[PDB]
Design brief:
This is part of a larger assembly, with 7 protein chains of 7 kinds. Chain A is α/β, with parallel strands linked by helices and about 100 residues long. Chain A is about 30% helix and about 15% strand. Chain C has 3 helices and 2 strands; from the N terminus they run αββαα. Chain C has helices spanning about 15-30, 55-65, 70-75, and strands at about 40-45, 50-55. Strand 2 (about 55-60) of chain F pairs parallel with strand 19 of chain G. The structure holds adenosine-5'-diphosphate (2 copies) and magnesium ion (MG) (4 copies). One magnesium ion (MG) binds near residues 35, 100 and 337 of chain B. Chain E: Belongs to the TCP-1 chaperonin family.
């Protein structure tokens, strides 16, 4: 099969189960973190309601990605790009396994 | 210099015992003000006696206890030699100041400096029910030029800042106001910027800016103010060119770059109350003065004297003059010694003879 | 350097054997071109401009400055 | 990759809907472009620039072989030897602009990974001589002899 | 430590082959070209500066050659043969 | 015999083969083997004095002057500053033994040194080093099979931990913490048994937080079935003790929200300014109310928080802790049985952890405060909190307890044990010698050399205990041969008996097997090197 | 063959190692040198050292504290580093006994060197020392007395302990006054253990006898320009708010307008927000406002117009001490005035100490925070007085925590060593010699105490040994005259925790140093 070293687990990783008996593996090249939508994206708002809406929109974007991953039935998640602490805790809450920064090879 | 504390501080003695003596001189200067050479000489003499005492075979603990006993007896003797003094007895205060100044370079100018010191101390304290003197209330201003005979006892305050409002000097019946805000274009603590997308807005920007500045100046003028002190500012311009022009047009003396640490002294001297927002700038927060005039010292500089204040404050200012800078510093130190002598006479109102009489009585 | 503690250099076995053979081959190659009727002479300059045009092997080997012991053995031979 | 402006590009977001829809719209546009390219029958795509991650993902999804050529001279030579026109944009190629080759595959010669554009016919505009050998200097000398 | 080991001594040079023959012939040709112009009734004189401050203004080939210090051994041989010609018959020095 | 080659051609022309060949050094043949064996012998003889209960400690000073007093072989070799490549190989061998087993990092070095010392005299008699390596491998196989034969199985049940206590005591006997022998052994056993997947799976050491603080006494070291925290309560006026705490673990700072994307909020009028300040105040009040609504008694945050939130938490009777590290956040969540919540909107009563007591602890006249989160229901994380009279014994206690934890982990992985004090080594040497008797002549020498090198451990143990090595070891071997009892070893503590089973000197079978295997492989690898090419530049 | 003395070299350039004899010699020399240096500052007749810094600052210190001497020296001997760390940890755990523990460790290691010279394995010495430490600890625990139940007896014990702690310091000149000062300061903590609540202020000038414990609290801050300098029946609100250009914490916010009039409106709104915050603060009904952070010109002008004292930049320690001394709550939000408790004191005024002015709180409501003004003729004198007072306060706080007390003057060491000697006489083997050496060091400690005073230390120690063997379990050194006396009557009392910590730490450090048989040093950078 395949075996590789553990790759800089975030907080809440130790709460994830460490053994599965028939897992579906989600091989991804995706950064599951709270981050700017684009390096050249600027948000211009003039209302506190729009400010709260923007914050909730970023959170909802991350949670939509996480929900799409979770509803696929996969129990093990591997990604080239970093997987943040929020995603790690989200997967720990669903008894899933996540590993970010997995090398290309 | 002739001050013992200054001599000990200026030279780096490099030896732990000598550094201890320097700290001892500092402590004597703090508590008494003069007698700083005497305490160091006494300590040196005591240790010189201690070397022979140790050679005789005495442990340096019997020596210490015996020195403590001798010190207690000497304090008793000195108190027995004392003489009660009343602060209303001006002759005793003058004699003490003259004795303090006798050992300094300004000993020749004693008939002028001694009454100056006595009056300066008396004008910053209440002769009845006073236990200490805050020498920070007696500001010393050093100006080159002239001789020590030109020293002065300005009862108001003097400022080294120059009058920005050139062409207007010597305001009579001054109504001084001290502001702590800035007379410039509007600016918020938040990041602010004005966006222009039309030439009409381009004209409106400076039109409304001049309107805002003019409104500020009109609000200041409406209170009857005619002398304005502006606290120093760094983040934004404290006084813009437009504001200065408007203030000059309304005949108001403008004096900027007032230091933050000087606000307390200025307010105590004049009676002004600082204003940090134009909304609270009212006539009741102004300091009435008899005359606010900018004087020149015969081409050696310029000074700003505000002399004569309704409800005068509990502060005085001393202007020290001299041919060269070194004699000016030494004159300042000598005046400080005299002020400290009068201060340590205010508390512990006891007097003894000098001239080595207490020391020889102690020895006997 | 080591447990032997001898102030000098030591070579053992194939290294020293190859060194000796190299020195002997150098001495031979010095004079190998001066053999037989189609041989040619040599100039030897004695560091001060003295010139010795010679074909004799003994003269060449005596005039040369030789340092290796095996080369000295061949020269004295 | 998705084409970008030449002066400066700033994504101005003013509502939550735009923030939540921007990435999805960008990905949909990439998918549509790659699908349009693949719908012309193209099964090999050669590019002179970098390859985006989403573009590579959608090329893999539609079974498209990607080869990236850094040298513009190599790109021109490939166009000459295959019969294709180097499109300046990411539009699907028209029938005349599409290249053709008998076989394109990844192969290993010795310890070197190579990509071979192979013609079955003994024709074409460009022919390649593959030189083997035991030393780099020997192959350089053989190349000089070939020249 | 560990001084270098070598068969012949240091600063012992050696050249062989066509290079040596070419160098010898070129040195001889240079020596000849030095005094080529001092032959015949229309020869012109040369002024030599002796190391000891003297001046040798002469037309004889042997004097010119013996006033010149050279490093190449072939040039030394040429100067030697000029001297031998001078000593044996008394002239013909620049012809030989 | 060095400096590569020096020929300069037979025609006098330059002969340059390798760059800087006049500066590089070379050693080849049997001389290289002798040098390697002598360096390894020096390292092993340095390390052999730190073996057994009577072993002494090495006191290492780093390049910055910091002092470490230790008995751990791997730590000693790591602290060493060496240039010899064989010494680096020995350091790596100790590191390998520490990584795989965690105990016996000194026995491997002594065994390898003895093996190479015997190989030296074998080489002097004209035996190819490959033959020596093959004989060593054969003898190692025989010894490993004998170890499997003479092993014993212990119970690794929580109900009866006495064999585990005995094994941990045997591991800790050689360390300085033996003054609290049984206490340290028992806390190590309980720590390992608490954090362990029971189905013979691994023991994750990330769930054991070993932290030490100066002061107190070494006997004050205790096992906390919870988490120790270097932080304290944020506001100085909140209570220092919380009972039956309902902890809300949060990774969101108690600050107004901040979008990750670069953003600008434009204030264009006075109404906008008023709305903004009202929004900030309402956000503070809302987060406080959201925390309070779940019924939580205590709040723990990872990213700190500002004055308004601090005073609101104090005003609402919500003791709070800020700037808790991520690993500490995870440990608290694991121990208290609560989930980690990324924002207040997702905080619910079901995600709250429970701890029976949260307390703030003072440490004398030092103004330093630390938090204890203990009395958890079924805490799956544990903390070892070490005290001492100086930081050096604290570090030594840390590594000694790590050795004990590793040994109990090894027992969990495999419960077969052998008896120490040299009994296992003596029995293995006897087995190897018996096997060599019925073996062809040529490899008999290699196998007997392996047996003699195996005999070094009892000799070192006896020497460190002040007894005559050869006499005591020979007597013990003769007694082992006479009555069939492979549990007879060196009586290092002078208890009056040589039966090491009665003395309860127990060590893991896998530890001894790994020791023998690693020593044999390293000795073979060293024996196969016949040429050294060092730069020899002696750079600064 | 060792690493150093082998034909092949296994080390970097500059890296070396010291084997058995060399390592033991280096350790013993370093430990004995440290102990000899720190001693002679021990006991009532100990003398002070001068610590002359070699750095650019060239700081000068005069101290009798063992930890202070040991930390400010550059020691390269690793065993010296072990002893220095032991002294530092002892100072951290309790405020006293650093010199005692260092001297005990040095004497133990000297006896260990003597034993090693007699062909005794260090492990045997370690075992004997462990047995001796157990016996001595049990004897000391059995010798302790407790008086926490009785208030007057406990106060007398506190006085005795403070006097004993201060007897060896420069404060022994005014021991009575300083002992009363320290005991009052500790008792004002009302059982709290934190020593940060006791602030020490050092003012140059005046005699050491002029030092006093203020009946209230003293603050070294200033007051605003137009604010009252004297408040009677103060109602104090302690705060930790901005009070300076207070900006909304939305960092992405900005002002984007198209005219300067809008900018003026926005700045007026900001000033109005500051004014409203000041009004909310004043709604609490307060006389004095103390803020941890700075207060700018507009808020202080508003406070002055309201006639409220406004003290700014009182740091975390300052606001905590004010809360402890007045009972107020450190607030940061002012939307619920009824939920915030205000401090109270009878009078606030400005006092004149030396040439500096300080804010004085009189008639404080709680008083669980002290300020101590130290007067002295020298900065070194002030620093040493502060260190001695800190030692006394630490010991008194420890005694308040644990009221068990033992007798000083060498009595505790004498009985400890008596128990150790009994155990050694009851034990066969060389471990008996090890325990005898342990007891010898225990005797050596009061021997050094007596030597520092110039008395006949041998005769006094022999008399103490005889008395403790004859059942006189309270006999100790009477330093007043140089004889032996009753420590219970003379009131030479020590904290049990301090002595136990000294014994255990010294034994532990001696054990860890004695276990070393090789010192390996890496090449320094
Ligand atoms: N109580 C004891 N009596 C005799 N020998 C012991 C005892 N405890 C441990 N040993 C032996 O000491 C040897 C070394 O153990 P130790 O020094 O603790 O760790 P390491 O194996 O890393 O050196 C072990 O092989 C063991 O057999
Ligand atoms: N008045 C006294 N009479 C007899 N012994 C005293 C007296 N005061 C202090 N000592 C003793 O002096 C010893 C050392 O105290 P000290 O010199 O202050 O240094 P440290 O307390 O740091 O060890 C204490 O053990 C104490 O028993
Ligand atoms: Mg004077
Ligand atoms: Mg002629
Ligand atoms: Mg071990
Ligand atoms: Mg003390």
């Amino acid at each position: 099969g395949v075996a590789f070293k553990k790759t800089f687990s975030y907080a809440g990783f130790e709460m994830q189960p460490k053994k599965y008996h028939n897992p579906k593996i989600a091989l991804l090249n995706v950064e599951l973190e709270l981050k700017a939508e684009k390096d050249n994206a600027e948000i211009r708002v003039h209302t506190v309601e729009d400010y709260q809406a923007i914050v909730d929109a970023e959170w909802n974007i991350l949670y939509d990605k996480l929900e799409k991953i979770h509803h696929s039935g996969a129990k093990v998640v591997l990604s080239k790009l970093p997987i943040g602490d929020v995603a790690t805790q989200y997967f720990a809450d669903r008894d899933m396994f996540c590993a970010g920064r997995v090398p290309e090879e | 210099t002739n001050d013992g504390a200054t001599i000990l501080k200026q030279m780096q003695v490099l030896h732990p015992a000598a550094r201890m003596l320097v700290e001892l001189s500092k402590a004597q200067d703090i508590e008494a003000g003069d007698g700083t050479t005497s305490v160091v000489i006494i300590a040196g003499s005591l240790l010189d006696s201690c070397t022979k005492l140790l050679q005789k075979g005495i442990h340096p603990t019997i020596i210490s206890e015996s020195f403590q006993k001798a010190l207690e007896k000497g304090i008793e003797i000195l108190t027995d030699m004392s003489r009660p003094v009343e602060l209303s007895d001006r002759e005793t205060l003058l004699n003490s100041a003259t004795t303090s100044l006798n050992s300094k370079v300004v000993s020749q100018y004693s008939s002028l400096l001694s009454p100056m010191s006595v009056n300066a101390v008396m004008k910053v304290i209440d002769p009845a029910t006073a236990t200490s003197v805050d020498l920070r209330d007696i500001k010393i201003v050093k100006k080159l030029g002239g001789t020590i005979d030109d020293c002065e006892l300005v009862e108001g305050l003097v400022l080294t800042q120059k009058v920005s409002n050139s062409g207007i000097t010597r305001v009579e019946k001054a109504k001084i106001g001290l502001i702590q805000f800035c007379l410039s274009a509007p600016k918020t603590d938040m990041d602010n910027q004005i966006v222009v997308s039309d030439y009409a807005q381009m004209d409106r920007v400076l039109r409304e800016e001049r309107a805002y500045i003019l409104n500020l100046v009109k609000q200041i003028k409406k209170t009857g103010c005619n002398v304005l002190l502006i606290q120093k500012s760094i983040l934004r311009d404290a006084l813009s060119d437009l504001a200065l022009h408007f203030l000059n047009k309304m005949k108001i003396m403008v004096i900027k770059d007032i230091e933050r640490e000087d606000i307390e002294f200025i307010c105590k001297t004049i009676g002004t109350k600082p204003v940090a927002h134009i909304d609270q700038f009212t006539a009741d927060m102004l300091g009435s003065a008899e005359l606010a005039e900018e004087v020149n010292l015969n081409g050696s500089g310029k000074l700003l004297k505000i002399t004569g204040c309704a409800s005068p404050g509990k502060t005085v200012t001393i202007v020290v003059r001299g041919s060269n800078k070194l004699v000016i510093e030494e004159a300042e130190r000598s005046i400080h010694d005299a002020l400290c002598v009068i201060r340590c006479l205010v508390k512990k109102r006891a007097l003894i003879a000098g001239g080595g009489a207490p020391e020889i009585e102690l020895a006997l | 350097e080591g447990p032997l503690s001898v102030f000098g250099d030591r070579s053992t076995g194939e290294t020293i054997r190859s060194q000796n053979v190299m020195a002997a081959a150098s001495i031979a190659n010095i004079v190998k071109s001066s053999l037989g009727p189609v041989g040619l002479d040599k100039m030897l300059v004695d560091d001060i401009g003295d010139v010795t045009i010679t074909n004799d092997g003994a003269t060449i080997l005596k005039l040369l400055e030789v340092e290796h012991p095996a080369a000295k053995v061949l020269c004295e031979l | 990759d998705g084409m970008i402006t030449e002066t400066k590009g700033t994504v101005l977001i003013k509502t939550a809907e735009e923030l939540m829809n921007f990435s999805k719209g960008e990905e949909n546009l990439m998918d549509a472009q790659v699908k349009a390219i693949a719908d012309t029958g193209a099964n090999v795509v050669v590019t002179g620039g970098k390859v985006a991650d989403m573009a590579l993902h959608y090329a893999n999804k539609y079974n498209i072989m990607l080869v990236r050529l850094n040298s513009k001279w190599d790109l021109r030579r490939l166009c000459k030897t295959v019969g294709a026109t180097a499109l300046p944009r990411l539009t699907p190629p028209v029938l005349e602009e599409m290249g053709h080759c008998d076989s394109v595959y990844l192969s290993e010669v010795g310890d070197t990974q190579v990509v071979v554009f192979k013609h079955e016919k003994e024709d074409g505009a460009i022919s390649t001589i593959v030189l083997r050998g035991s030393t780099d200097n020997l192959m350089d000398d053989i190349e000089r002899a070939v020249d | 430590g560990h001084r270098p080991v070598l068969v012949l001594s240091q600063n012992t040079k050696r050249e062989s082959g066509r290079k040596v023959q070419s160098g010898n012939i070129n040195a001889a040709k240079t020596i000849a070209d030095i005094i080529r112009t001092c032959l015949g009734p229309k020869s012109m004189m040369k002024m030599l500066l002796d190391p000891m401050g003297g001046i040798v203004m002469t037309n004889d080939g042997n004097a010119i050659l013996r006033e010149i210090q050279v490093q190449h051994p072939a040039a030394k041989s040429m100067i030697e043969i000029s001297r031998t010609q001078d000593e044996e018959v008394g002239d013909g020095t620049t012809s030989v | 015999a060095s400096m590569g080659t020096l020929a300069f051609d037979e025609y006098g022309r330059p002969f340059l083969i390798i760059k800087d060949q006049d500066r590089k050094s070379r050693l080849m043949g049997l001389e290289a083997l002798k040098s390697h064996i002598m360096a390894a012998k020096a390292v092993a003889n340095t390390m052999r004095t730190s073996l057994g209960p009577n072993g002494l400690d090495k006191m290492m000073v780093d390049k910055d002057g910091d002092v470490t007093v230790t008995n751990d072989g791997a730590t000693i070799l790591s602290m060493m500053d060496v240039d010899h490549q064989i010494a680096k190989l020995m350091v790596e061998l100790s590191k390998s033994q520490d990584d795989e087993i965690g105990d016996g990092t000194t026995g491997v070095v002594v065994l390898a040194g003895a093996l190479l010392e015997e190989a030296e005299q074998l080489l002097d008699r004209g035996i190819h080093p490959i033959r020596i390596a093959d004989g060593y491998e054969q003898a190692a196989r025989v010894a490993i099979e004998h170890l499997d034969k003479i092993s014993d199985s212990v119970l690794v049940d929580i109900k009866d931990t006495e064999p585990l206590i005995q094994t941990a005591k045997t591991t800790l006997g050689s360390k300085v913490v033996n003054s609290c022998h049984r206490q340290m052994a028992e806390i190590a056993v309980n720590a390992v048994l608490t954090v362990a997947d029971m189905e013979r799976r691994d023991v994750d050491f990330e769930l054991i937080k070993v932290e030490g603080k100066v002061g107190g006494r070494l006997e004050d070291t205790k096992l906390i079935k919870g988490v120790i925290v270097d932080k304290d309560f944020s506001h100085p006026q909140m209570p220092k003790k919380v009972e039956d705490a309902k902890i809300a673990i949060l990774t969101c700072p108690f600050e107004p929200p901040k979008p990750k994307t670069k953003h600008k909020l434009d204030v264009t009028s006075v109404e906008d300014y008023k709305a903004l300040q009202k929004y900030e105040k309402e956000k503070f009040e809302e987060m406080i109310q959201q925390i309070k609504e779940t019924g939580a008694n205590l709040a723990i945050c990872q990213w700190g928080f500002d004055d308004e939130a601090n005073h609101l938490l104090l005003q609402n009777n919500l003791p709070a802790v800020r700037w808790v590290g991520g690993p500490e956040i995870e440990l608290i969540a694991i121990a208290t049985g609560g989930r980690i919540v990324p924002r207040f909107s997702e905080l619910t009563a079901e995600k709250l952890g429970f701890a029976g007591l949260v307390q703030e602890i003072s440490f004398g006249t030092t103004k330093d405060k630390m938090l204890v989160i203990e009395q958890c229901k079924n805490s799956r994380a544990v903390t070892i909190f070490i005290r001492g009279g100086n930081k050096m014994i604290i570090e030594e206690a840390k590594r000694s307890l790590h050795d004990a934890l590793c040994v109990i982990r090894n027992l969990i992985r495999d419960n077969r044990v052998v008896y120490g004090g040299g009994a296992a080594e003596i029995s293995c040497a006897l087995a190897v010698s018996q096997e060599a008797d019925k073996c062809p002549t040529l490899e008999q020498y290699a196998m007997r050399a392996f047996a003699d090198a195996l005999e070094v451990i009892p000799m070192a143990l006896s020497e460190n205990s002040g007894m005559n090595p050869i006499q005591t070891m020979t007597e013990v071997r003769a007694r082992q041969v006479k009555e069939m009892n492979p549990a007879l070893g060196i009586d290092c503590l002078h208890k009056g008996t040589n039966d090491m089973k009665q003395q309860h000197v127990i060590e893991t079978l896998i530890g001894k097997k790994q020791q023998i295997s690693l020593a044999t492989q390293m000795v073979r690898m060293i024996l196969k090197i016949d040429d050294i090419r060092k730069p020899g530049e002696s750079e600064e | 063959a060792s690493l150093s003395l082998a034909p092949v070299n296994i080390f970097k350039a500059g890296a070396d190692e010291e084997r058995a004899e060399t390592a033991r010699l280096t350790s013993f020399i370093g430990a004995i040198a440290i102990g000899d240096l720190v001693k002679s500052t021990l006991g009532p007749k100990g003398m002070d050292k001068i610590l002359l810094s070699s750095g650019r600052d060239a700081s000068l210190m005069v101290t009798n504290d063992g930890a202070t001497i040991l930390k400010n020296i550059g020691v390269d001997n690793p065993a010296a580093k072990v002893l220095v760390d032991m002294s530092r940890v002892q100072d951290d755990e309790v405020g006293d006994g650093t010199t005692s523990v260092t001297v005990l460790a040095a004497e133990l290691l000297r006896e260990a060197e003597s034993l090693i010279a007699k062909k005794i394995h260090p492990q045997t010495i370690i075992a004997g020392w462990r047995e001796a430490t157990k016996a001595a600890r049990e004897a000391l625990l059995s010798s302790a007395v407790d008086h926490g139940s009785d208030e007057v007896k406990f106060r007398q014990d506190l006085m005795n302990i403070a006097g004993t702690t201060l007897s060896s310091k420069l404060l022994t000149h005014h021991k009575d006054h300083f002992t009363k000062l320290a005991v009052e300061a500790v008792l004002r903590l009302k059982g709290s253990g934190n020593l940060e609540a006791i602030h020490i202020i050092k003012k140059l000038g005046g005699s050491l006898a002029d030092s006093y414990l203020d009946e209230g609290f003293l603050l070294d801050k200033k007051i605003g320009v137009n604010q009252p300098k004297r408040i009677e029946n103060a109602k104090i609100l302690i705060a930790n708010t901005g009070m300076d250009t207070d900006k909304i914490k939305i960092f992405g916010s900005r002002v984007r307008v198209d005219s300067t009039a809008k900018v003026a409106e926005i700045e007026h709104a900001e000033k109005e927000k500051m004014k409203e915050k000041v009004e909310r603060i004043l709604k609490h009904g307060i006389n004095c406002f103390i803020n941890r952070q700075l207060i700018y010109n507009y808020p202080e002008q508003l406070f002055g117009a309201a006639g409220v004292m406004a003290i700014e930049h009182a740091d975390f320690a300052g606001v905590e001490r004010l809360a402890l001394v007045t009972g107020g709550e450190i607030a940061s939000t002012f939307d619920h005035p009824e939920l915030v408790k205000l401090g109270s004191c009878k009078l606030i005024e400005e006092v004149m100490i030396g040439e500096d002015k300080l804010i004085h709180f009189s008639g404080v409501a709680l008083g669980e925070a002290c300020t101590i003004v130290l007067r002295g003729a020298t900065q070194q004198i002030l620093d040493e007085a502060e260190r001695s007072l800190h030692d006394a306060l630490c010991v008194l706080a420890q005694t308040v925590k644990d009221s068990r007390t033992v007798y000083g003057g060498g009595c505790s060491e004498m009985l400890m060593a008596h128990a150790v000697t009994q155990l050694a006489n009851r034990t066969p083997g060389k471990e008996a010699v090890a325990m005898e050496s342990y007891a010898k060091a225990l005797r050596m400690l009061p021997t050094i105490i007596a030597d520092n005073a110039g008395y006949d230390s041998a005769d006094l120690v022999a008399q103490l040994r005889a008395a403790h063997s004859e059942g006189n379990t309270t006999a100790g050194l009477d330093m007043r005259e140089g004889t032996i006396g009753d420590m219970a009557i003379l009131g030479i009392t020590e904290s049990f925790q301090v002595k136990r910590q000294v014994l255990l730490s010294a034994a532990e450090a001696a054990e860890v140093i004695l276990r070393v048989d090789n010192i390996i040093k890496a090449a320094p950078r």
